[PDB]
Amino acid sequence: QKRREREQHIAECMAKMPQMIVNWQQQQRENWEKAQADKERRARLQAEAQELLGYQVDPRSARFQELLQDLEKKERK
Amino acid sequence: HLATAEWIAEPVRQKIAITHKNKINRLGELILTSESSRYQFRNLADCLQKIRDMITEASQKLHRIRIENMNRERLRQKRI
Amino acid sequence: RLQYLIDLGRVDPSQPIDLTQLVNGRGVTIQPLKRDYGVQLVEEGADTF
Amino acid sequence: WHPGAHVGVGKNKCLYALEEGIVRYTKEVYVPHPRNTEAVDLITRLPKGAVLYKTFVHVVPAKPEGTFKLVAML
Amino acid sequence: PVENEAVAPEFTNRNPRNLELLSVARKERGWRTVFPSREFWHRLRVIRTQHHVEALVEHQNGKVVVSASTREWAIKKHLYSTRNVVACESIGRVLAQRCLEAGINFMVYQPTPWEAASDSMKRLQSAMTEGGVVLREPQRIYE
Amino acid sequence: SKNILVRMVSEAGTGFCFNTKRNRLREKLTLLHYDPVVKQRVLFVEKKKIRSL
Amino acid sequence: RRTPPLGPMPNSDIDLSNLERLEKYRSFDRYRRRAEQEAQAPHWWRTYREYFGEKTDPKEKIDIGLPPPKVSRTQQLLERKQAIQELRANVEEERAARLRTASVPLDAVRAEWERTCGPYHKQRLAEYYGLYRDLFHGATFVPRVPLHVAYAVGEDDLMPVYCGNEVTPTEAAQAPEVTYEAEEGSLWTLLLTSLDGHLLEPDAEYLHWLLTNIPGNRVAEGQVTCPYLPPFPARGSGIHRLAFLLFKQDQPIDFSEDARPSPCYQLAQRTFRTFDFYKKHQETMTPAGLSFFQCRWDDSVTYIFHQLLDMREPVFEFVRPPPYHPKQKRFPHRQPLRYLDRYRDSHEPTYGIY
Amino acid sequence: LTYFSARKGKRKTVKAVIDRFLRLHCGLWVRRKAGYKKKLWKKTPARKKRLREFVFCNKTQSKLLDKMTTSFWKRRNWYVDDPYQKYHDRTNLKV
Amino acid sequence: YKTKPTHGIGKYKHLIKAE
RNA sequence: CUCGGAGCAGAACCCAACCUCCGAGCAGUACAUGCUAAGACUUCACCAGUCAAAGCGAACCUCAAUUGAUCCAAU
Ligand SMILES: [Mg+2]
Ligand SMILES: [Mg+2]
């Protein structure tokens, strides 16, 4: 009984494995897409001068603008 | 001898003949040897097991070889 | 060794052989307090038997 | 030193022979792989007409692979 | 007792090519630090000059097996450019059919990164493959 | 306390497991690995933590 | 201690007083060029070449053979210049080359090559495969005369025969067709020889297809002293390289020592030495043509073993030497338990006296 | 080590080596390599295999063990379905 | 090796610029 | 108070000093960082530590030390 039940369990599991493997592939692909979505934003920051502490000052304005735009869109939905 | 064995049927007979021409003697008798063990009784046993597996399957680098064969066969195209 | 002993003539093949007759012929040692539950046969000697 | 003529290399830069025979040392020319950027830049900055050598080990195969012998005369 | 039945125990073939065609010979494995890998039996070497294009299929001993050349009149009589992608592809086809002629079914080629990225070498390799030669050496047998 | 050693398991019920290092900041990881009994590449999920390093 | 350098050390031609004005290796390619050139060049110190490279004698290989014809180099280069001129003057080749859509007649290229520059590459292949080192013990020649041979398979198709081509025994079971397009007003001779076919001793060959006193390209009129018999490449022997030799018989010669009866399929009859054969018979003539191929074992080879040759078939095999293991010691240290298996003969168990 | 007992006046074996080692009748001793059970995560495959593998020991160690142990653990032993019946005996040794 | 005439065959630093 | 590298120790190996210097007790990338196996080195013994052919099964690791035995405990 033990042998049969464990064998059928592993069998059904390995039969199911391909679907979750495709799910894992698309998971990696969407993670890479989010990496794209954030690095496209981090690429350019300022085009005026090369400040030291100012680097992470002005971007927050546009970032919060986009955040509130998304929030208003979701509230509208 | 192969063809004299009445206890074997003709399909298995000619099948073994054509599949294992390497081991057949000039006089037509198939021969097989075994010295893997020290026990000649066990040697006879595994020999008869081999020939039984042969009966069953008859009743039922290769890459490189076929590659060079296909090369020869693409080259050989010529007209008289 | 069994062939050796039956040729020597200590064991009587005309009668049923068993470990009693073997040890009476001194063919094998046994040490029951050493938890040797008996005797097995060995593949060696299949020929000339 | 550097390998050559049936001489492998371990991860810790240990030299070992691949086949059975006689060891010997010689000098030969050294050409890196294009990924070895250090030696690549070295041979580029090098002045024309001059070439560098390096030591190399070679094991000489004493015996052949095997021999053709009769198995059965039938 | 038959004069034709007389056979020696060992059979001595003086063919250096027997073992390498049987896959049993030893390749010059090693030189892992150096770029040209000696782990071959039949290496191809392409020379791309500013006047012609040459190709040498040669044995590991440094000696030539077969050669193709743009300097050959037999080859260039039909040929416009001596160095273009067309010239490289034609030399590829010629050397491929020459290998089929000389029985060379397998061989090796060590291209550099840019030499591989060049479409000329790519189309040359495609031409040879369609001619019927593979640029891969079988794995040695022993054990 | 940068990294963490975590175990992952055969989801088939084979009981085959092993351990790897991970950054505790990062999310749960699920990776392919050669399960000898199942004798092919199969995803394992990492379940729990054992000790920091 | 120190010792002076024997020969001129490398990179000594250069000067260090001027370094910036000197141009450097702009390219891995140029460095490779110079490197392999100097590698082909010799050196006084010990090198890989004088251990793993051919130890051929320094003297050039003797070859009293067909010299090249006297071609007018001036007129030849002039006609070649005219050819390339009209070629560049053609109009479609521009688009063909710049669109990568052109090809070339393989048959025409092959014929022109085997006419002009073939023989040198044929010499190359010959002294590669080792035909000359085995036949003439070093001496060489040039097969100026082309040579075509075919094994007609059935009625429609045929297997060609050229330098380095596979030949199946089922196809080589019969005599082939031959052409060498040479009138010459004189005679010719042809012989098919197997080098590694003989088994009892080395440097010994067999002869399968012999024709002598061939008046012109016609072949059937050429008499035969050694009748036809296919080779017998045995199973496990590997491969056998068989060569077509062709000589330019200036005048008919005798064959007493060579006169052979009906085949008799006698290896002692077929066996001889091409070296002394050429030395004694071929002082009047010289080599003119050359080809070869390779053969392997087959079912037809088995048939001719059992029936034609009238002898049992041999069965060889490649066998490697035993794997080395050192001498044992009574007390190994830090070795796994299979240390004993590395030396035990029988994997089976054994009991001493019980 | 305990060359004589107080109750019988005989030698006495240390059960430590019994727990640790295994003796072959031909005079050999074997042991499981130390450090095979801890710190597997940082170790490499080669190291893990070298540690899992069995080993023999020196003649010095073997005879130290033999001196501390008694003859009963040196006797010949015929087990059932134990693979070491092949190795209790020695084969192809000279000098 | 130093004693032997082949000493200094591999050195290149005097060829390249030093910095 | 251990480990690694350089000089002292110039040229196969070894060489101390409360001798002279610079460092470490990690980190990063994969998840075949899987299993087995010929032959060999070894921090002057041991403990340990090391390289690895071929094969099955697969594709088509860097760094210098970067670390810890037995018993016992947890599972
Ligand atoms: Mg030591
Ligand atoms: Mg391997």
DSSP single-letter state for residue G223: B
Q: Measured at the alpha carbon of residue G57, what is the angle toward residues G53 and G61, in degrees to the nearest 5?
A: 115
Question: Which residue in D71, D73, D74 has the most chain B C-beta atoms within 10 A of its own C-beta, making it the best mutation to test that interface?
Answer: D74
Q: Which residues are G167's β-sheet partners?
A: G295
Token pair recorded at residue A2: 């033990």
* Burial class of residue E113 in the structure, from the number of CB atoms within 10 Å of its CB (0-12 exposed, 13-18 middle, 19+ buried): exposed
Sort residue G341 into left (φ over 0), alpha (ψ -120 to 50) or beta. Answer: alpha
G188 SS3 class: coil
Question: Which residue in G100, G163, G274, G293 has the most chain E C-beta atoms within 10 A of its own C-beta, making it the best mutation to test that interface?
Answer: G100
Distances (CA, A) of E82 to E53, E97, E116, G105: 7, 20, 20, 17
Question: Which residue in F9, F16, F30 has the most chain A C-beta atoms within 10 A of its own C-beta, making it the best mutation to test that interface?
Answer: F30
Give me the amino acid identity at A2.
K
Q: Please state, in angstroms and rounded to a whole number, the distance separating the CA atoms of residues E29 and E24.
A: 14
Q: Please state, in angstroms and rounded to a whole number, the distance separating the CA atoms of residues G232 and G296.
A: 8
Q: Are G24 and D47 in contact (CB under 8 A)?
A: yes
G320 SS3 class: coil
The CB density around residue E128, as the number of other CB atoms within 10 Å, is 25
Q: Please state, in angstroms and rounded to a whole number, the distance separating the CA atoms of residues G158 and G150.
A: 6
Distances (CA, A) of G225 to B26, G242, G248, G304: 31, 19, 17, 21
Q: Please state, in angstroms and rounded to a whole number, the distance separating the CA atoms of residues G4 and G153.
A: 71
Residue G121: phi and psi, rounded to 5, are -70, -25
Token pair recorded at residue G321: 């030497």
Give me the amino acid identity at F37.
V
Sort residue C31 into left (φ over 0), alpha (ψ -120 to 50) or beta. Answer: beta
Token pair recorded at residue H68: 């501390």
Q: Please state, in angstroms and rounded to a whole number, the distance separating the CA atoms of residues G123 and F45.
A: 66
The verdict on B75 touching E (C-beta cutoff 8 Å) is yes
Q: Which helix (H) or strand (E) holds I8?
A: none
Q: Please state, in angstroms and rounded to a whole number, the distance separating the CA atoms of residues G293 and G144.
A: 19
The gap between H5 CA and J3 C1' (Å) is 47
Q: Which of E143, E72, E55 is nearest to E107 (CA)?
A: E55
Q: Which nucleotide is nearest to E143 (CA to C1')?
A: J54
Q: Please state, in angstroms and rounded to a whole number, the distance separating the CA atoms of residues G125 and G148.
A: 17
Q: Where are the alpha helices (DSSP H) in E8-134?
A: 16-21, 73-76, 85-101, 113-117, 119-131
Nearest to H55 among G336, G340, G344 (CB): G336
Give me the amino acid identity at F47.
K
Distances (CA, A) of H88 to G349, G350, H25, H69: 11, 11, 5, 18
Q: Please state, in angstroms and rounded to a whole number, the distance separating the CA atoms of residues H73 and H77.
A: 9
* Cβ within 8 Å, pair E13-D73: no
Domains of chain F in start order, with CATH, are 2-53 (2.20.28.120)
Give me the amino acid identity at C27.
G
* Cβ within 8 Å, pair E101-G162: yes
DSSP single-letter state for residue G321: P
Q: Please state, in angstroms and rounded to a whole number, the distance separating the CA atoms of residues G36 and G23.
A: 20
D58 SS3 class: strand
Distances (CA, A) of E119 to E53, E85, E89, G197: 15, 8, 10, 47
Q: Please state, in angstroms and rounded to a whole number, the distance separating the CA atoms of residues G42 and G8.
A: 12
Full domain range(s) for residue G288: 122-308
Q: Please state, in angstroms and rounded to a whole number, the distance separating the CA atoms of residues A51 and G269.
A: 99
Q: Which residues are H84's β-sheet partners?
A: none
Q: Are G117 and E74 in contact (CB under 8 A)?
A: yes
Distances (CA, A) of B32 to B22, B49, E137, I9: 11, 12, 36, 64
Residue G189: phi and psi, rounded to 5, are -145, 145
Query: Neighbouring chains of D at 3+ CB pairs within 8 Å?
Result: B, E, G, I
Q: Would you tell me the crossing angle of helices E85-101 and B62-75 to the nearest 10 degrees?
A: 100
* Cβ within 8 Å, pair G2-I17: no
H64 SS3 class: helix
Q: Which nucleotide is nearest to F35 (CA to C1')?
A: J34
CA of G333 to the centre of ligand 1 (A): 13
Q: Which of B72, G169, B64, D4 is nearest to E23 (CA)?
A: B64
Q: Are E121 and E115 in contact (CB under 8 A)?
A: yes
Measured between CA atoms, how close is A17 to chain F, in angstroms?
7
Q: Which of G208, G212, G162 is nearest to G186 (CA)?
A: G212
Token pair recorded at residue E125: 């390799």
As a dihedral over the C-alpha atoms of residue H41, residue H45, residue H50, residue H51, rounded to 10 degrees, the angle is 20
DSSP, residue by residue, G101-146: -----HHHHHHHHHHHTHHHHHHHHHHHHTHHHHHTTT------S-
CA of E139 to the centre of ligand 2 (A): 9
Given CATH 3.40.50.2300, say whether it is the number of domain B1-60. no
The CB density around residue I7, as the number of other CB atoms within 10 Å, is 14
Q: Please state, in angstroms and rounded to a whole number, the distance separating the CA atoms of residues D18 and D28.
A: 20
Q: Are H17 and H70 in contact (CB under 8 A)?
A: no
Counting Cα atoms < 13 Å in the Cβ hemisphere of H42 gives 5
Counting Cα atoms < 13 Å in the Cβ hemisphere of E20 gives 19
Distances (CA, A) of G4 to A1, G15, G47, G282: 86, 20, 19, 56
Residues 6+ apart with CB under 8 A from E122: E116
Q: Please state, in angstroms and rounded to a whole number, the distance separating the CA atoms of residues E91 and E123.
A: 11
Residues 6+ apart with CB under 8 A from C9: none
Q: Please state, in angstroms and rounded to a whole number, the distance separating the CA atoms of residues G228 and G176.
A: 10
What is the edge-to-edge ordering of all strands in the sheet holding G189-194? G166-167, G287-295, G240-247, G189-194, G206-211
Nearest to I15 among D27, D46, D53 (CB): D46
Token pair recorded at residue G240: 């056998």
Give me the amino acid identity at I9.
I
Sort residue F24 into left (φ over 0), alpha (ψ -120 to 50) or beta. Answer: alpha
Q: Please state, in angstroms and rounded to a whole number, the distance separating the CA atoms of residues H8 and G179.
A: 106
Distances (CA, A) of H18 to C32, H14, H31, H53, H66: 23, 7, 11, 19, 11
Q: Are F27 and F43 in contact (CB under 8 A)?
A: no
Whose tokens are 């729990």? That residue is F48
The CB density around residue G37, as the number of other CB atoms within 10 Å, is 11
Distance of CA G344 to the CA centre of its chain: 45
Q: Please state, in angstroms and rounded to a whole number, the distance separating the CA atoms of residues G240 and E78.
A: 39
Measured between CA atoms, how close is I4 to chain G, in angstroms?
6
Q: Which of E113, E81, E53 is nearest to G100 (CA)?
A: E81
Contacts of F20 in chain H (CB under 8 A): 41
Q: Which helix (H) or strand (E) holds G270?
A: helix G267-270
Q: Are H65 and H39 in contact (CB under 8 A)?
A: no
The gap between H34 CA and J47 C1' (Å) is 9
Give me the amino acid identity at E14.
R
* Burial class of residue B30 in the structure, from the number of CB atoms within 10 Å of its CB (0-12 exposed, 13-18 middle, 19+ buried): middle
Q: Where are the alpha helices (DSSP H) in chain H?
A: 15-20, 45-52, 59-68, 85-88
Query: Neighbouring chains of G at 3+ CB pairs within 8 Å?
Result: B, C, D, E, H, I
Token pair recorded at residue C35: 């938890």
Token pair recorded at residue H64: 């130290």
Q: In chain A, what's the furthest Cα-to-Cα distance? A: 75
Q: Which residues are F18's β-sheet partners?
A: F8
Q: Which helix (H) or strand (E) holds A24?
A: helix A2-43
DSSP single-letter state for residue B30: B
Distance of CA G235 to the CA centre of its chain: 22
Nearest to G80 among E5, E11, E73 (CB): E73
CA of G334 to the centre of ligand 1 (A): 13
**Contacts for G23-30: CB closer than 8 Å, 24+ residues apart:** G23/D47, G23/D48, G24/D44, G24/D45, G24/D46, G24/D47, G24/D48, G25/D43, G25/D44, G25/D45, G25/D46, G25/D47, G25/D48, G26/D44, G27/D44, G28/D34, G28/D40, G28/D43, G28/D44, G28/E112, G30/D48
CATH assignment at residue G168: 3.90.280.10
Q: Which residues are G246's β-sheet partners?
A: G190, G289
DSSP single-letter state for residue G330: S
Q: Are F44 and F33 in contact (CB under 8 A)?
A: yes
Q: Are E59 and E42 in contact (CB under 8 A)?
A: yes
Q: Entry resolution in angstroms?
A: 4.5
Q: Which of E29, E37, E62 is nearest to G36 (CA)?
A: E62
Segments making up each domain of chain E, as ranges = 2-142
Decide: F and E in contact? Rule: 3+ Cβ pairs under 8 Å: no
What is the edge-to-edge ordering of all strands in the sheet holding H29-32? H21-23, H29-32, H54-56
**Pairing between β-strand G240-247 and β-strand G287-295 as defined by DSSP bridges:** antiparallel
* Burial class of residue B68 in the structure, from the number of CB atoms within 10 Å of its CB (0-12 exposed, 13-18 middle, 19+ buried): middle
**Pairing between β-strand D67-73 and β-strand G314-319 as defined by DSSP bridges:** antiparallel
Determination technique for this entry: cryo-EM
Residues 6+ apart with CB under 8 A from F21: F3, F4, F5, F6, F53, H41
Ligand positioned closest to the Cα atom of G333: 1
Q: Which of G128, G267, G151, G141 is nearest to G204 (CA)?
A: G267
Q: Which of G174, G112, G177 is nearest to G146 (CA)?
A: G112
Helices and strands, counts by H and E, chain D: 1, 5
Residue G258: phi and psi, rounded to 5, are -95, -20
* Burial class of residue E109 in the structure, from the number of CB atoms within 10 Å of its CB (0-12 exposed, 13-18 middle, 19+ buried): buried
DSSP single-letter state for residue D37: H
Which residue numbers in chain B precede an interruption (C–N > 2.5 Å)?
60
Q: Please state, in angstroms and rounded to a whole number, the distance separating the CA atoms of residues F9 and F28.
A: 13
Contacts of G325 in chain D (CB under 8 A): none
The gap between H42 CA and J49 C1' (Å) is 15
Sort residue G66 into left (φ over 0), alpha (ψ -120 to 50) or beta. Answer: beta
Distance of CA A39 to the CA centre of its chain: 12
Q: Which CATH number fits domain D1-74: 2.60.40.10, 2.40.340.10, 3.40.710.10, 2.40.50.100?
A: 2.40.50.100
The CB density around residue D66, as the number of other CB atoms within 10 Å, is 14
Q: Please state, in angstroms and rounded to a whole number, the distance separating the CA atoms of residues H33 and H20.
A: 10
CA of H76 to the centre of ligand 1 (A): 35
Counting Cα atoms < 13 Å in the Cβ hemisphere of E79 gives 26
Q: Which residues are G319's β-sheet partners?
A: D67
DSSP, residue by residue, G31-98: HHHHHHHHHHS--SS--SHHHHS----SSPPP---PPPP---HHHHHHHHHHHHHHHHH-SHHHHHHH
Distance of CA G170 to the CA centre of its chain: 23
CATH T-level topology, domain E2-142: Nucleotidyltransferase; domain 5 (3.30.420)
